[PDB]
Scaffold this motif. Structure first.
Motif, PDB file in Angstrom:
ATOM      1  N   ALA C  25       0.808  -1.210   0.000  1.00 31.62           N
ATOM      2  CA  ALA C  25       0.000   0.000   0.000  1.00 31.62           C
ATOM      3  C   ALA C  25       0.846   1.267   0.000  1.00 31.62           C
ATOM      4  N   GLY C  34       2.506  -2.627 -21.445  1.00 29.19           N
ATOM      5  CA  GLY C  34       2.900  -3.810 -22.177  1.00 29.19           C
ATOM      6  C   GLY C  34       2.844  -5.099 -21.393  1.00 29.19           C
ATOM      7  N   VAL C  35       2.450  -5.051 -20.117  1.00 29.11           N
ATOM      8  CA  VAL C  35       2.385  -6.224 -19.250  1.00 29.11           C
ATOM      9  C   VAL C  35       1.302  -5.949 -18.214  1.00 29.11           C
ATOM     10  N   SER C  36       0.769  -7.023 -17.629  1.00 28.30           N
ATOM     11  CA  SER C  36      -0.097  -6.966 -16.462  1.00 28.30           C
ATOM     12  C   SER C  36       0.645  -7.498 -15.248  1.00 28.30           C
ATOM     13  N   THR C  38       0.010  -8.904 -12.431  1.00 29.11           N
ATOM     14  CA  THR C  38      -0.308 -10.224 -11.897  1.00 29.11           C
ATOM     15  C   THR C  38       0.449 -11.311 -12.648  1.00 29.11           C
ATOM     16  N   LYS C  39       0.480 -11.212 -13.978  1.00 32.49           N
ATOM     17  CA  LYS C  39       1.133 -12.207 -14.820  1.00 32.49           C
ATOM     18  C   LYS C  39       2.656 -12.160 -14.733  1.00 32.49           C
ATOM     19  N   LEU C  43       6.273 -14.947 -15.477  1.00 34.42           N
ATOM     20  CA  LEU C  43       7.101 -14.537 -16.602  1.00 34.42           C
ATOM     21  C   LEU C  43       8.560 -14.403 -16.190  1.00 34.42           C
TER      22      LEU C  43
END
Lengths: 49, 49, 50
Positions: C25, C34-36, C38-39, C43
């Motif tokens: 927080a 170009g990315v999320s 969470t993913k 990666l």
């Protein structure tokens, strides 16, 4: 749907958002249709203690 | 070369197919020409675009 | 460092638990292009430049 949050987390009340509120408290659908209304309540919900 | 008229036909078809296959290697404005990468790198909100 | 002299740190040969970042927080702006985020846990990358 009515509730109360903190200002920094207001952004989380929206489709496709992440964070504490969206993940654990209140999650909108990605294709959500409808309106979100939010306003400060410091004068009402805050206490000196 | 006597049977060129036949050969031409064959060649043309093959060429067509080849271009079609190579069209799978183009981004067309996307961020990657591989669907799996886009699915693995973006959430639905923009993966859909 | 000052913005004109921004510092660059190279990250390599390590495990990056990005949760510590996106579950914290302490950040007011967290925007990934170009990315999320969470993913990111699923990666790998060859170059990380903080």
């Amino acid at each position: 749907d009515s509730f109360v949050i903190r200002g920094d987390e207001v952004r989380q009340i929206a489709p496709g958002q992440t964070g504490k509120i969206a993940d654990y408290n209140y999650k909108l659908p990605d294709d959500f249709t409808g309106c979100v209304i939010a306003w400060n309540s410091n004068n009402l919900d805050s206490k000196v203690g | 070369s006597a049977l060129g008229k036949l050969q031409d036909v064959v060649n043309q078809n093959a060429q067509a197919l080849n271009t079609l296959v190579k069209q799978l290697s183009s981004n067309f404005g996307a961020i990657s020409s591989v669907l799996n990468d886009i699915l693995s790198r973006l959430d639905p909100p923009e993966a859909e675009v | 460092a000052s913005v004109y002299a921004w510092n660059r740190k190279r990250i390599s040969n390590c495990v990056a638990d990005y949760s510590v970042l996106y579950n914290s927080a302490s950040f007011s702006t967290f925007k990934c292009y170009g990315v999320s985020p969470t993913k990111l846990n699923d990666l790998c990358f060859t170059n990380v430049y903080a």
